[PDB]
Design a protein around this ligand. Structure first.
Ligand code: HEM
Ligand code: HEM
Ligand code: HEM
Ligand code: HEM
Ligand code: FES
Lengths: 102, 288, 62, 81, 379, 379
C-alpha cells in the first residue's frame, strides 16, 4: 500500500490535465511571406498541419519553408528573415543554420 | 521444569522429615550394584598389586547385575523461561543467564571449551587493571560495571549448560546485559584467527596444570570411565585442539547462540533487569 | 523424516536477517503483479455491459 | 533521577514466565473467552443502558408531538371557522 | 553505558523519554487515544499541505479553484476528502481523550490538565476558520452568524467586530485573513503539544484502578509500541471506509452553491461537532447573557479539579458517581440533536430543560455524590 | 534550591540553559552575531506574516496586489520595505557568523558545525523562492534560469524539471507552489535552530585566544544580556537608516514591470548576495561540469574540519595562516563584482582566474600553511 500511497501524493504534483490540454494540434497559422512577427507563445504555440512539432526555434519556427511548402513566411521573412534570419540574438551572426536549414 | 533433573540435590525440606530408612534400603539396594560402581586409584600403586587386593569382596558382595529396568534415564526438555526473586533489602543483585548445550561425549564439546576462555572473566581483586585483554575484563574493570563475573560450563549426560554469572549493583545491571550480548554476538560473526590463540593456549595451560597432585588425577579417572568410557586421551587432547580454527568456532557458536531462547534466573534487587522480550531481542544482531 | 516445509524455510531464509529482509521485497514485488490483476476481473465480472470496456465494442473503430 | 532504579522497594515477590515461543497465541480463545465476555458484560449493563433508554423515548415522543402540531393544521382548529 | 549509542548524539537521550518511559501494566485500550490524536494531527498537516499548493485565496477565485481540484488534478479528489473527513475523525478521537480524563479522574494532575484545556480551545478555533475557506453558501452565512454574534460586548463591541472583518461585512479581506491564519495555526498546536506531553513525563501515567502503580512497571518499547500501531491501524479503515465508499455522509452540509449575500438558506447550522455549543445559545433569550454561557460552556472544565470531593480517585469504584456520569453523556447527546432541529415549541422547551440539567450535573450533583459515599464507607 | 521559583514549573529549569550558562570572560563583539541572527529571524516572521494577510497568489492577481499594498493600506509601505530589506540585513549578519567560524577555528566543534552547514543551505533556498513571489520581470526570468539550469542531470533531468514546474513553463501552478513553500519553510529553520543551539550547551563557547577557558567563567544574565541588547540596538538603525531614507539602494533590481514572457531584459542577475555563486557558473564552459562546481561551492565548508593541520586552534597566532585568509576575503569580494558585469573578454578571463585561486587557497594553501609553522616553532 505504501508504494501506491507515495506515488499518489507525488503524482498530484506531477502534472495537470489542463496544461495537458496544451501541446498544439492546430498550429496552424499563419502570416504570409515576410511578417515575423509570427510568434504567439502558449508554452507550445503538431503543429498539424503536418506533422510536425520538430523545431526550428520558438515562436513560429515553424518549419523550413515547411520543407519548401508553406511555413508562414517560407524563409525569407521580413527583417531580418525566417531561417537565416539572424534573428539569432540581437540579431546576429549565426542565423538559423545549422546547415540544411532543417 | 518437569524432569527428574529439575530438582534440588537435597530436596525440599518436608521430605527430610518424612524420610524413613525403608526407602534408603530400597535406594541402597537399587543403585549400588555394579556396573554402576567404579574403583580407581593413583599413586605408588601399580596395577597388579592392586588387582589381587581388588579381588575378594569385592568380587564380591554384589554389587550384582540383574535389571532395575534400564536405565531409568530419558532425555529432558529445554524450557526457555525466566524467574525473579525480587528482594530489595540486599546490597547486590545476582544474575545468571544460560543457553542449553550438548552432552559429555560430542565433538562440539571442545570448541565451546575454548570460546568461554576467550570472553574471559574478571573479579574485583585482580591485579589486571584496565589493560587486560579479555574484552569484558577491560570494560567492566574500567567503571566496575560489575563486581565480578565468571563463565561456567556444565555438561550432563545428554545435556549441557552455557552461560555466565555476574554480580553488580542495581543501577548498573542493564549495562552488563548489553555489553555481554556484545561478546557472544561478535563471536558468532566477527571472530578472528589471532584472538583464538590466546584462548587456545590457556586451555592447554589449565588442562595440564589441572593434573598436578595425586587426587586431582585420580578424581578425573573416576568420572572419565563413567563418562567417555576408559578414554584418558591425554596427548590426544592436544591433537583434538588443533582442530580448532576460525571456521570451526563460528560454525559451532552459530548453532547454540544466535537466535535462541535464553534461560534467565535472578535474585533481588533485580528490578532493573530488563523484561524478557528485550533479551530475546538482544540475542540476534540485525547487523547493528 | 524430512524437515517440515517451515523447518527448511526457517533455516534457509529467516535465519539470516538480510535474506529475511530481501525475501520480503521480492515477495511484495510478485505480489502486486498478480494480486492487482485478479481484483479487476472480480470487479469487472460484476459489471458486464456497464463499461465501455465491453460497451466500447459497439462503437470503436466505427 | 533515573527512572527504573529507585522506583520503589518490594520484597519477596517471585515471578515466573515462559518464552513467547513455548506457548500459544490463543489459549482456548473461544471456549474460555466467550463466557468471560458475558459475565463482564452484565456487571456494567445495569449502570449503562437506562439513561440512553430515556433518550430514545424522548426522541420518538418528541417527533410525534412535533408532527401533530405542524403537519395537521385542521387539528385543533378545523376548517370550520 | 559503554558504547550505548543512545548517549553519543545527546538528542537520543532526549529520545529515551519514549523508549524506556516506564508505564503501568494494566492499561485499557482507552489509553490508545494518546497516540491516535497525534497521528490524526500529522496526517492533517501533510494532506493539509498538498491542498494548499493548488488552492487560491480570492473572492473571485477561491470556489472555482476547489472545483479545479476535484476535477482536473491527478489523485486530486482523494486528498480533499482525506482532509475534510480527517477533521471529523480528529474530534471523535478528541472527545474520548477527554472522557477518559474524567471517568478515571486523571484530572488530578493539575498542570497537565490545564494545558489540556487550552490545547482543546485552540483546535476549535482552527477547525472553524478553515471551514470558511471553500467560500460556499454555508460558509458565508455561517461566518457572519458566529462573528457578528460577538458584538454583544457593551461598548467596544461595535468596533472590535468591524476590526476583524476589515470592513463592514465579510467581503474579500475577511477571507484572505482566514487563510493565513488557518495555515499557520496548527504549527502552534504542534508547539504546545510537545509541552503538554512534557509535564506528564514527571509523574507518569495514571492507571484504571486509580492506585499508585509504583511496584509494577513495564518497558515502553516492545509492548505498547505494537498496541499503538494496532491502534494506529484501525483508524485507517474508520477513516478510509468513510472517506472512500460514503464521502458525503458525515459531510452533512449539503451546500456547494457559490455564496450569494442576497439569498439566505432556510436552515443554517455548523457542522456536527459544534452543534451542541450552538444549541446552548438558542436557549437564552437575552443576547448578552446568552453569549457568556457559550464561553462558559467549556471553561468549566478548568474548574473541575477544585471539585474533587472524595477520598478515592477513580470512578470505577463509585457506583453513584458512575451512575450520574452516564446521564451526562446522553445529556450532551441530547443537545447535539436538539440544535439540529428547528426552533418550534416542542423543541424550544426541551433545550431550555436540558440546558439547566447539564450544569446541574457537573456543578452540583457530582460534587455532592462523592460526599455521601465517604460517609457511607465510614471513611 | 529552597523555594527557588526556577524548579517549580519544570520548563524554567530548561530556561536555565540561558541565564546561568557559563561563558568565557573575554569575548569580542564578533560573538554578538549569535543573537542578531535570531532577532533578524523573528522580525521576519511577524513582518513576514502581516504581508501574507493582504497578499494573493495568482498569475492574474499577484502583481496587482503588491501594488495594492504600497498604495492603499495604512502603514502598508513600511512593512513591505522592512521585509525585503530585512532579508539583506539577514545575510550580512549571516556571513560574518561564518567568518568568526573559521578565523578562530570554531569549526573544531564537529557536530555543531555540520548542522551549521545545513542551516545555511536552507536559508539560501527560502530567500530565493520568496523573491519569485512579486512576479515582476526580474522574478520571472530569474526563475527560469535557475530552475531550467537543473536539466543538466544526464537522464532523469528532463522529467525532474518538468515535475517542479507542473507543466512546460513557469505559468500559474509554478507560482502557487512557491508561495506555499516560502510560507511554511522558515518554521523548519526555526525548528533546526533550537537543535543547532543544543549541542553547543554541552561544550560551551570557544573564545578568541583558542584556549580551554575552564578557569575563567561568568554568569550569562547580568553581563552578556546587556551586550546583546546593545548589539540588538545598532541593528535597528542599520535596518531603519537603510529602509527609511534610501529604500531602493540595496534594492538593486530595478524591475517592477509585469512579466512578459516574450520580451527579455538585457541584463539579468540575482540580487546581490547570490551573485558570486552565479559568477562561478559562467566560468565553466561545459554545462554539466559547470553545475557541479556551484553545488560544490558551499559543500566544501563541510570538509574543512578534516583539514585542521596544526597544533593550535586559533588563527590569531598564525601570521601566515592569517595572511592568506584575508586574500580569500578579497577573492570572494572579487567574484561578487565580477558576476555583476557583462561577459566580455576583459571580464571573462578574470573570473576564470579568480575561480581557481578560490579553491587553491582553501583546498591547498591553507592546509599547507599549518604544516610549515609546526615545523618552524620546533613542535
Ligand atoms: C489540526 C489541523 C487542521 C485542521 C483541523 C484542519 C481543518 C480543516 C478543515 C475543517 C477544512 C475545511 C474542510 C473542507 O473545506 O473540506 C480545512 C481546509 C483547508 N485546510 Fe486545514 N486543517 C488543518 C491543517 C491544515 C494545514 C496544516 C494546512 C496547510 C498546510 C491546511 C490547509 C487547508 C486548506 C488550504 C484548506 C482549504 C482546502 C479545502 O478546504 O478544501 N489545513 N482544514
Ligand atoms: C491535540 C490535542 C491533544 C494531544 C495531541 C494530546 C496528546 C496526549 C498524549 C499523547 C498523551 C499521553 C498519552 C495519554 O496519557 O493518554 C496525553 C495525555 C493526557 N492529555 Fe492530552 N492530548 C490532547 C488533548 C488533550 C486535552 C484537550 C486534554 C484535556 C482537556 C488532555 C488531557 C490529557 C491528560 C489528562 C492526559 C494524561 C492522562 C493520563 O496519563 O492518564 N489532552 N495527551
Ligand atoms: C527567514 C525568513 C524569511 C525570509 C528570508 C524571507 C524572505 C523574503 C524575501 C526575500 C521576499 C521577497 C522580498 C520582496 O519581494 O520584496 C519575501 C517575500 C515574502 N515573504 Fe518572506 N521571508 C521570510 C519569512 C517569511 C514569512 C515567515 C512569511 C509569512 C508569514 C513570509 C511571507 C512572505 C510573503 C507573502 C512575501 C511576498 C510579499 C512580497 O514579497 O512583497 N516570509 N520574503
Ligand atoms: C539561521 C542560522 C543560524 C543561527 C540562528 C545561528 C545561531 C547561533 C547561535 C545563537 C549561536 C550561539 C552564539 C554563538 O556561538 O555565536 C551559534 C553558534 C554557532 N553557530 Fe550558528 N547560527 C546560524 C548559522 C550558523 C551557520 C550557517 C553556521 C556554520 C555554517 C553556524 C555555526 C555556528 C558555530 C560554529 C557556532 C559556535 C561558535 C562558537 O561557539 O564559538 N551557525 N549559532
Ligand atoms: S442573530 Fe439574526 S437570527 Fe439569531
Amino acid at each position: 500500500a505504501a508504494k501506491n500511497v507515495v506515488s499518489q501524493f507525488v503524482s498530484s504534483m506531477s502534472a495537470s490535465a489542463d496544461v495537458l490540454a496544451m501541446s498544439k494540434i492546430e498550429i496552424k497559422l499563419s502570416d504570409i511571406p515576410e511578417g515575423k512577427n509570427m510568434a504567439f507563445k502558449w508554452r507550445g504555440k503538431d503543429q498539424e498541419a503536418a506533422v510536425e512539432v520538430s523545431q526550428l526555434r520558438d515562436p513560429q519556427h515553424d518549419l523550413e519553408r515547411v520543407k519548401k511548402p508553406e511555413w508562414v513566411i517560407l524563409i525569407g521573412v521580413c527583417t531580418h528573415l525566417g531561417c537565416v534570419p539572424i534573428a539569432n540574438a540581437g540579431d546576429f551572426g549565426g542565423y538559423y543554420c545549422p546547415c540544411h536549414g532543417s | 521444569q518437569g524432569t527428574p533433573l529439575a530438582q534440588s540435590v537435597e530436596g525440599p525440606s518436608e521430605n527430610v522429615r518424612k524420610l524413613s530408612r525403608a526407602d534408603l534400603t530400597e535406594y541402597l539396594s537399587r543403585h549400588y550394584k555394579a556396573p554402576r560402581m567404579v574403583l580407581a586409584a593413583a599413586g605408588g600403586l601399580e596395577h597388579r598389586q592392586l588387582l589381587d587386593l581388588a579381588q575378594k569382596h569385592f568380587s564380591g558382595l554384589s554389587g550384582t547385575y540383574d535389571e532395575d529396568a534400564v536405565p531409568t534415564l530419558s532425555p529432558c526438555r529445554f524450557t526457555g523461561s525466566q524467574i525473579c526473586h525480587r528482594e530489595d533489602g540486599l546490597p547486590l543483585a545476582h544474575v545468571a543467564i544460560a543457553v542449553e548445550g550438548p552432552g559429555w561425549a560430542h565433538p562440539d564439546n571442545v570448541a565451546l571449551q575454548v570460546a568461554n576462555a576467550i570472553i574471559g572473566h574478571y573479579d574485583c581483586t585482580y591485579g589486571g587493571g584496565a589493560h587486560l585483554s579479555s574484552p569484558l575484563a577491560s570494560i567492566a574493570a574500567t567503571n566496575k560495571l560489575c563486581q565480578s563475573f565468571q563463565t561456567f560450563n556444565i555438561c550432563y549426560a545428554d545435556t549441557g549448560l552455557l552461560g555466565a554469572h555476574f554480580v553488580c549493583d542495581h543501577m548498573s545491571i542493564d549495562d552488563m546485559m548489553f555489553v555481554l550480548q556484545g561478546q557472544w554476538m561478535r563471536l558468532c560473526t566477527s571472530a578472528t584467527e589471532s584472538e583464538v590463540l590466546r584462548g587456545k593456549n590457556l586451555l592447554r595451560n589449565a588442562l595440564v596444570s589441572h593434573l598436578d597432585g595425586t587426587t586431582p588425577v585420580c578424581e578425573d579417572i573416576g568420572r572419565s570411565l563413567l563418562t567417555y568410557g576408559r578414554r584418558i586421551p591425554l596427548a590426544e587432547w592436544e591433537s583434538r585442539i588443533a582442530e580448532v580454527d576460525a571456521r570451526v568456532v563460528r560454525e559451532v557458536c552459530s548453532k547454540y547462540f544466535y537466535d535462541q531462547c535464553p534461560a534467565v534466573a535472578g535474585f533481588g534487587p533485580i528490578e532493573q533487569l530488563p523484561d524478557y522480550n528485550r533479551i530475546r531481542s538482544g540475542m540476534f544482531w540485525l547487523r547493528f | 523424516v524430512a524437515p517440515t516445509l517451515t523447518a527448511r524455510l526457517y533455516s534457509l531464509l529467516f535465519r539470516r536477517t538480510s535474506t529475511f529482509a530481501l525475501t520480503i521485497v521480492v515477495g511484495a514485488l510478485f505480489f502486486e503483479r498478480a494480486f492487482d490483476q485478479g481484483a479487476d476481473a472480480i470487479y469487472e465480472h460484476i459489471n458486464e455491459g456497464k463499461l465501455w470496456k465491453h460497451i466500447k465494442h459497439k462503437y470503436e473503430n466505427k | 533521577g533515573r527512572q527504573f532504579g529507585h522506583l520503589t522497594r518490594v520484597r519477596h515477590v517471585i515471578t515466573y514466565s515462559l518464552s513467547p515461543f513455548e506457548q500459544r497465541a490463543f489459549p482456548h480463545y473461544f471456549s474460555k473467552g466467550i463466557p468471560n465476555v458475558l459475565r463482564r458484560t452484565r456487571a456494567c449493563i445495569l449502570r449503562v443502558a437506562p439513561p440512553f433508554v430515556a433518550f430514545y423515548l424522548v426522541y420518538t415522543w418528541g417527533t410525534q408531538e412535533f408532527e401533530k402540531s405542524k403537519r395537521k393544521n385542521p387539528a385543533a382548529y378545523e376548517n370550520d371557522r | 553505558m559503554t558504547n550505548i549509542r543512545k548517549s553519543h548524539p545527546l538528542m537520543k537521550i532526549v529520545n529515551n523519554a519514549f523508549i524506556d518511559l516506564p508505564a503501568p501494566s494494566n492499561i485499557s485500550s482507552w489509553w490508545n487515544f494518546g497516540s491516535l490524536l497525534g497521528i490524526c494531527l500529522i496526517l492533517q498537516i501533510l494532506t493539509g499541505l498538498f491542498l494548499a499548493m493548488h488552492y487560491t485565496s480570492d473572492t473571485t477565485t477561491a470556489f472555482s479553484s476547489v472545483t479545479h481540484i476535484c476535477r482536473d488534478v491527478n489523485y486530486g479528489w482523494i486528498i480533499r476528502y482525506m482532509h475534510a473527513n480527517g477533521a471529523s475523525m480528529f474530534f471523535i478521537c478528541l472527545y474520548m481523550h477527554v472522557g477518559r480524563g474524567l471517568y478515571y479522574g486523571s484530572y488530578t494532575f493539575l498542570e497537565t490538565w490545564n494545558i489540556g484545556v487550552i490545547l482543546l480551545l485552540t483546535v476549535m478555533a482552527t477547525a472553524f476558520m478553515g471551514y470558511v475557506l471553500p467560500w460556499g453558501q454555508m460558509s458565508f452565512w455561517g461566518a457572519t452568524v458566529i462573528t457578528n454574534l460577538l458584538s454583544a460586548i457593551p461598548y467596544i463591541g461595535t468596533n472590535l467586530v468591524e476590526w476583524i472583518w476589515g470592513g463592514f461585512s465579510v467581503d474579500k479581506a475577511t477571507l484572505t485573513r482566514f487563510f493565513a491564519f488557518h495555515f499557520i495555526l496548527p504549527f502552534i498546536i504542534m508547539a504546545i503539544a510537545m509541552v503538554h506531553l512534557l509535564f506528564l513525563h514527571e509523574t507518569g501515567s495514571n492507571n484504571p484502578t486509580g492506585i499508585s502503580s509504583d511496584v509494577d512497571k513495564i518497558p515502553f518499547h516492545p509492548y505498547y509500541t505494537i498496541k499503538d500501531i494496532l491502534g494506529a491501524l484501525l483508524l485507517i479503515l474508520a477513516l478510509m471506509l468513510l472517506v472512500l465508499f460514503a464521502p458525503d455522509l458525515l459531510g452533512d452540509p449539503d451546500n456547494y452553491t457559490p455564496a450569494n449575500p442576497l439569498n439566505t438558506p432556510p436552515h443554517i447550522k455548523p457542522e456536527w461537532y459544534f452543534l451542541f455549543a450552538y444549541a446552548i445559545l438558542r436557549s437564552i433569550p437575552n443576547k448578552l447573557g446568552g453569549v457568556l454561557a457559550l464561553a462558559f460552556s467549556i471553561l468549566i472544565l478548568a474548574l473541575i479539579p477544585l471539585l474533587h470531593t472524595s477520598k478515592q480517585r477513580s470512578m470505577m469504584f463509585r457506583p453513584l458517581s458512575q451512575c450520574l456520569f452516564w446521564a451526562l453523556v446522553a445529556d450532551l447527546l441530547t443537545l447535539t440533536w436538539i440544535g439540529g432541529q428547528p426552533v418550534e415549541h416542542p423543541y424550544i422547551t426541551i433545550g431550555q430543560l436540558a440546558s439547566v440539567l447539564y450544569f446541574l450535573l457537573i456543578l452540583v450533583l457530582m460534587p455532592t455524590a462523592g460526599t455521601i459515599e465517604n460517609k457511607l464507607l465510614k471513611w
